[PDB]
Design an enzyme around this catalytic site. Structure first.
Site, PDB file in Angstrom:
ATOM      1  N   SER A 142     -27.534  52.042  17.362  1.00 38.83           N
ATOM      2  CA  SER A 142     -26.037  52.528  17.339  1.00 38.83           C
ATOM      3  C   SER A 142     -25.713  52.589  18.983  1.00 38.83           C
ATOM      4  O   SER A 142     -25.830  53.741  19.470  1.00 38.83           O
ATOM      5  CB  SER A 142     -25.596  53.606  16.649  1.00 38.83           C
ATOM      6  OG  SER A 142     -24.192  54.220  16.994  1.00 38.83           O
ATOM      7  N   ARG A 143     -25.673  51.584  19.688  1.00 43.62           N
ATOM      8  CA  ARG A 143     -25.244  51.631  21.082  1.00 43.62           C
ATOM      9  C   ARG A 143     -24.231  52.562  21.485  1.00 43.62           C
ATOM     10  O   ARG A 143     -24.504  53.595  22.029  1.00 43.62           O
ATOM     11  CB  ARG A 143     -24.306  50.104  21.361  1.00 43.62           C
ATOM     12  CG  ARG A 143     -25.001  48.906  20.221  1.00 43.62           C
ATOM     13  CD  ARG A 143     -24.961  47.614  20.837  1.00 43.62           C
ATOM     14  NE  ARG A 143     -23.527  46.706  20.722  1.00 43.62           N
ATOM     15  CZ  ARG A 143     -23.270  46.037  19.582  1.00 43.62           C
ATOM     16  NH1 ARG A 143     -23.934  45.719  18.527  1.00 43.62           N
ATOM     17  NH2 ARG A 143     -21.989  45.339  19.759  1.00 43.62           N
TER      18      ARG A 143
END
Ligand SMILES: Nc1ncnc2c1ncn2[C@@H]1O[C@H](COP(=O)(O)OP(=O)(O)OP(=O)(O)O)[C@@H](O)[C@H]1O
Ligand SMILES: [Cl-]
Ligand SMILES: [Mg+2]
Length: 487
Positions: free
Chosen positions: A349-350
């Site tokens: 999850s950037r």
């Protein structure tokens, strides 16, 4: 002019094929997707779902038995709307907003169209606030931020809905309005899920949109668009919403069945498959808005089902590409008892990382490193002629950390508790216990923290970081607990 064409082809059409709750029309050249149309003779209404020239696909709303070939269709120039708002909280509705829970009419004061164009970057600001799932594996390793698009993907029976529903259960007191969209699931299964949402107190801030396996493909197809609208009501009024699409695999199947219900016009057997664009449009509506538009957000949790963990298949590839992050579940992990069955090395999850609170950042970094080192070593550990003490220690630590990532269903955990439990792990305090006793240690430790050190939890909670002072006290509380813990 004896045989001139009578009708306006832009706004008017003629049914050329009708059946199974669908019609195809000649004309209506300027109709848009999700626009309402009217069958003039009968007065019945429909919704456009396919814009093929002179072969427009129309979902008939209600009685289709009276619609015949040759009937005139007229654009109403209005995108179909659903009731949205506070009046839907606590309710179970179909995709058109009709109640399915026996609690009476909705009496909504507001409505929104099921389609809007997703705002451009000019209207957004960066994701900066966490969406706490309350699930240790995600909140530590795959943090989600409010406004983002996070995929939950994996094979059947790997625990996908469970993550989603636990996330919803955890939003009590988080200031997040929740929309759960059931697409194509059996009525019985959906009923069980609604019951859990009720039992765990989530319905107070939650709306459930149902289009079950026994509902027509048309309702299944509309479901997520209606649900998104319902969430946008809050997002666009300075509030935070979370919409769960369970699932987009079934949605793709329903959209395909809709297309197949009518026959192809002669001499044109292949119109392009735009399911990619359908999901792309839906998910781009997840948003973190700027201050001028109120500052609210809409977080999207689409679910995709794989077969044999084939994440290279079409829908998986599509949705992976149009989401900011991916949570991967696997049946091997599930079967071994690693539940939730999340692959934390592959998941990502950037956009969520910066939003993650400091206290959690302070323990997630070491977690990640220790697990990385563990997995490297596991490449060969079982075939090693011997491993040095340092390497054995790294393996032990890693096994302890994995155990801490296990979590029972319906038990989301407050962030401050996640922090102190993960601190105990990353700092080595479980290394000397048998792995089979980590769960109990965690359970007993947290009771102990409330009984004798609530002020530590309160401080982490309030400050959202672990200060040196509180850290020292924590070290001492853990040591103190170990003093009396029965191995
Ligand atoms: N953290 C957990 N601990 C123990 N059991 C769990 C956990 N999460 C889910 N389960 C159980 O595992 C099974 C699969 O869960 P769920 O139905 O949420 O998975 P799914 O991928 O959504 O499956 P489906 O393909 O039926 O939609 C269920 O019986 C559920 O109760
Ligand atoms: Cl309407
Ligand atoms: Mg499911």
């Amino acid at each position: 002019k004896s045989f001139e064409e009578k009708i306006d082809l832009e706004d008017t059409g003629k049914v050329i094929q009708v059946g199974d709750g669908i019609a195809r029309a000649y004309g209506l050249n300027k109709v848009m997707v999700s626009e309402l149309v009217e069958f003039v003779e009968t007065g019945v209404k429909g919704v456009a779902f396919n814009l093929e020239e002179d072969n427009v696909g129309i979902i008939i709303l209600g009685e289709y038995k009276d619609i015949k070939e040759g009937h005139t269709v007229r654009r109403l120039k209005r995108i179909i709307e659903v009731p949205v708002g506070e009046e839907l909280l606590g309710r179970v509705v179909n995709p058109l907003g009709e109640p399915l829970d026996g609690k009476g009419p909705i009496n909504a004061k507001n409505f929104r169209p099921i389609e809007i164009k997703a705002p451009g970057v000019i209207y957004r600001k960066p994701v900066d606030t966490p969406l706490q799932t309350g699930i240790k594996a995600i909140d530590s390793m795959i943090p989600i931020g409010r406004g983002q698009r996070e995929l939950i993907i994996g094979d059947r029976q790997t625990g996908k809905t469970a993550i989603a529903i636990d996330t919803i259960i955890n939003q009590k007191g988080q200031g997040v309005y929740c929309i759960y969209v059931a697409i194509g699931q059996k009525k019985s299964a959906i009923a069980r899920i609604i019951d859990k949402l009720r039992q765990y107190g989530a319905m107070e801030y939650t709306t459930v949109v149902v289009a079950s396996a026994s509902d027509p493909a048309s309702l299944q197809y509309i479901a997520p668009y209606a649900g998104c609208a319902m969430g946008e009501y809050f997002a666009y009024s300075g509030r935070d919403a979370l919409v769960v699409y369970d699932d987009l695999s079934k949605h793709a199947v329903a959209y395909r069945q809709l297309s197949l219900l009518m026959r192809r016009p002669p001499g044109r057997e292949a119109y392009p498959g735009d399911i990619f664009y359908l999901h792309s449009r839906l998910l781009e509506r997840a948003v973190r808005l700027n201050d001028k538009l109120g500052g609210g957000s809409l977080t999207a949790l689409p679910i995709v089902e794989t077969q044999a963990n084939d994440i290279s298949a079409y829908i998986p590839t599509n949705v992976i590409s149009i989401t900011d992050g991916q949570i991967y579940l696997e049946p091997g992990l599930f079967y071994a008892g690693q539940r939730p069955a999340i692959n934390v090395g592959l998941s990502v999850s950037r956009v969520g990382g910066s939003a993650q609170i400091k206290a959690m950042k302070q323990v997630a970094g070491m977690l990640r490193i220790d697990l990385a080192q563990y997995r490297e070593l596991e490449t060969f550990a079982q075939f090693a002629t011997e491993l040095d003490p340092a390497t054995r220690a790294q393996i032990i630590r890693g096994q302890r950390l994995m155990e801490l990532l296990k979590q029972e269903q319906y038990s989301p955990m407050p962030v401050e508790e996640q922090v102190v439990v993960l601190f105990a792990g990353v700092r080595g305090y479980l290394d000397d216990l048998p792995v089979e006793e980590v769960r109990r240690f965690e359970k007993e430790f947290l009771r102990f923290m409330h009984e004798k050190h609530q002020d530590i939890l309160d401080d982490i909670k309030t400050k959202k970081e672990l200060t040196s002072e509180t850290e020292e006290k924590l070290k001492k509380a853990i040591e103190e607990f170990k003093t009396t813990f029965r191995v």
